[PDB]
Amino acid sequence: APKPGKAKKVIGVIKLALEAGKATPAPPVGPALGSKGVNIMAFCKDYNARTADKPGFVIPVEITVFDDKSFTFILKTPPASVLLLKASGAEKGSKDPQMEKVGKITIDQLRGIATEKLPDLNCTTIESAMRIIAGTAANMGIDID
Amino acid sequence: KESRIGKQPIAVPSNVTIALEGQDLKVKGPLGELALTYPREVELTKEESGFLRVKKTVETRRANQMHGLFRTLTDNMVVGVSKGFEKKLILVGVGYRATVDGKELVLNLGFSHPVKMQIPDSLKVKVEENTRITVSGYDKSEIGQFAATVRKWRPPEPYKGKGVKYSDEIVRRKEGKAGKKK
Amino acid sequence: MLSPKRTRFRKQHRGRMKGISYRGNRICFGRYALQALEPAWITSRQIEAGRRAMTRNARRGGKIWVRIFPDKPVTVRPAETRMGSGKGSPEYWVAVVKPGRILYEISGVAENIARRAVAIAASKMPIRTQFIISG
Amino acid sequence: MKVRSSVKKMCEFCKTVKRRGRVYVICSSNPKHKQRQG
RNA sequence: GCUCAGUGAUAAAGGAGGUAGGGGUGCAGAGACAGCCAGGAGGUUUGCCUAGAAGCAGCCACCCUUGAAAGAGUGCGUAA
Numbered sequence: 001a002p003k004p005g006k007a008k009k010v011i012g013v014i015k016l017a018l019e020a021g022k023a024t025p026a027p028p029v030g031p032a033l034g035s036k037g038v039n040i041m042a043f044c045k046d047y048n049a050r051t052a053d054k055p056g057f058v059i060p061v062e063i064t065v066f067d068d069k070s071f072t073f074i075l076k077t078p079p080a081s082v083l084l085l086k087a088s089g090a091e092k093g094s095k096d097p098q099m100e101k102v103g104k105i106t107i108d109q110l111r112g113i114a115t116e117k118l119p120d121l122n123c124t125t126i127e128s129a130m131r132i133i134a135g136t137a138a139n140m141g142i143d144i145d
Numbered sequence: 146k147e148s149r150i151g152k153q154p155i156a157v158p159s160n161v162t163i164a165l166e167g168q169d170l171k172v173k174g175p176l177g178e179l180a181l182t183y184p185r186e187v188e189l190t191k192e193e194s195g196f197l198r199v200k201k202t203v204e205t206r207r208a209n210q211m212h213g214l215f216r217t218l219t220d221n222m223v224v225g226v227s228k229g230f231e232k233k234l235i236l237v238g239v240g241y242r243a244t245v246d247g248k249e250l251v252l253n254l255g256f257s258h259p260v261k262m263q264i265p266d267s268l269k270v271k272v273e274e275n276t277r278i279t280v281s282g283y284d285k286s287e288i289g290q291f292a293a294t295v296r297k298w299r300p301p302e303p304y305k306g307k308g309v310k311y312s313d314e315i316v317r318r319k320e321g322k323a324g325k326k327k
Numbered sequence: 328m329l330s331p332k333r334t335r336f337r338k339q340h341r342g343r344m345k346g347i348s349y350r351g352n353r354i355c356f357g358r359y360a361l362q363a364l365e366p367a368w369i370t371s372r373q374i375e376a377g378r379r380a381m382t383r384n385a386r387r388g389g390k391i392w393v394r395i396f397p398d399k400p401v402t403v404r405p406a407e408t409r410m411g412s413g414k415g416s417p418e419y420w421v422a423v424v425k426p427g428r429i430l431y432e433i434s435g436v437a438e439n440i441a442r443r444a445v446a447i448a449a450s451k452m453p454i455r456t457q458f459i460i461s462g
Numbered sequence: 463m464k465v466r467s468s469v470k471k472m473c474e475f476c477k478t479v480k481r482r483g484r485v486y487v488i489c490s491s492n493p494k495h496k497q498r499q500g
Numbered sequence: 501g502c503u504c505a506g507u508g509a510u511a512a513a514g515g516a517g518g519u520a521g522g523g524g525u526g527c528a529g530a531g532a533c534a535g536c537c538a539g540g541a542g543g544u545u546u547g548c549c550u551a552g553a554a555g556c557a558g559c560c561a562c563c564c565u566u567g568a569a570a571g572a573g574u575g576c577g578u579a580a
Contacts, residue, residue, distance in 0.1 A: 093547045097561045122542040122566050135563045140547050147534050468515040
């Protein structure tokens with residue numbers, strides 16, 4: 001494993017898909033990690049604060065509770081799907097992969113997405129990362145130049 | 146899948162001495178002495194090297210049924226009269242407890258009357274806690290069979306698992322509630 | 328041993344399954360195949376329940392071929408005595424499935440997927456079936 | 463245990479052992495797989 | 501020489517390594533198989549649909565990366 005990171009896992013962690021600046025509503029985040037331990041009142045302020053550096057998309061949040069009332073979380077990179085939708089300028093993917101295409105992306109696009117979304121992909125070289133996300137567009141109906 | 150036959154060389158330390166005469170090998174040790182009768186058509190001798198030897202008449206598929214059988218009835222007695230065997234029994238549920246009263250053991254598993262279990266020969270029973278029921282024995286058939294009778298009363302129900310269960314027995318707790326739609 | 332036919336003046340005698348002489352085909356279409364051992368009166372409700380089952384475990388794949396065709400009609404007596412010959416269409420129609428002849432054929436797929444496919448198809452057949460391959 | 467004529471194994475957790483001329487199939491996974499005759 | 505069924509002194513489709521004989525094939529001390537110990541990862545929480553379904557209702561897709569090994573993947577399970 002040339003890419004360190006293999007540590008302890010499975011410790012009662014919850015993962016959601018909230019949007020940068022969206023966590024105040026009760027119905028949404030409410031039922032989510034509400035009976036775990038973390039207070040619904042908190043997190044929200046500490047969420048839209050760190051995600052304020054780029055409000056406009058969804059950022060993978062990792063919530064991990066403890067034996068106390070406190071809590072900790074880490075900000076990750078957006079899905080390799082939503083990114084291909086932004087570069088292609090489309091709302092949703094296609095209904096039939098390959099059969100129907102919704103948009104197309106250049107090599108520079110797939111390359112830029114692999115870089116921005118690198119500190120989350122388990123790879124070694126750059127030519128790989130790009131090819132890793134390339135297979136994602138081939139599922140939502142998005143051919144590459 | 147499954148491989149081929151394989152003998153398990155189990156003899157000496159001389160903590161167990163064998164003495165065969167006629168289709169009846171005798172097993173001794175620091176604990177006690179066991180005896181088992183074996184059918185004919187087979188021979189057995191005590192090698193000078195220090196290993197329980199056993200041979201067969203022919204290489205027929207039926208011979209393996211015998212040779213591969215007596216092979217164990219000669220080793221289970223060895224470790225049985227040396228290392229010994231002790232089974233731990235644990236109970237679950239309120240009101241369930243184990244208490245000894247001499248040579249007999251009494252239990253209370255829902256039954257209106259306290260059931261009693263007698264202790265046979267070549268077998269010993271001890272109860273450290275009202276939840277633990279250990280029973281030391283020499284051989285395996287006795288100590289084992291005596292474990293089925295003490296669990297024959299009321300086994301662990303697939304809802305809460307109460308009554309009598311072997312040590313580290315995964316009864317696999319199953320949800321009793323039904324009708325729910327995933 | 329039947330397939331979709333067309334309207335016509337069909338209404339003749341019964342017939343009689345003779346020796347294996349006639350039937351004795353081989354494996355032309357498809358990789359593997361399936362033959363019979365003893366002649367019989369295979370109805371349409373059997374071939375249809377066997378064909379759909381052949382592709383029931385596949386769904387969208389290769390193609391099914393039928394190198395057979397029914398002929399010998401089937402007349403049955405209602406419940407009365409015997410005044411004349413039967414109708415010929417009360418229940419259905421059949422033919423003759425003598426041994427040596429080929430029935431179902433599968434190809435364009437793997438060996439395993441084409442093996443279990445014939446299995447269920449054989450269950451639909453009232454007469455015992457023999458599994459083959461090629462050569 | 464369901465009688466039936468054709469027992470046949472159910473899941474990979476089936477050993478299908480013949481006992482007293484009667485082929486049985488004990489499954490430690492789901493008792494529903496436990497069949498008698500076959 | 502086989503059956504050890506009392507089958508032979510009724511009875512099918514089908515099911516089961518109960519069992520004898522003959523031939524051949526795959527893996528195999530660059531050490532296979534059963535068992536024991538450990539790993540079984542990341543994007544993809546994938547697309548579509550759905551109140552929700554993140555291997556595991558269903559439809560389509562089912563490629564790629566890091567490696568000794570690990571399929572967007574079998575069975576159980578959760579409202580998810």
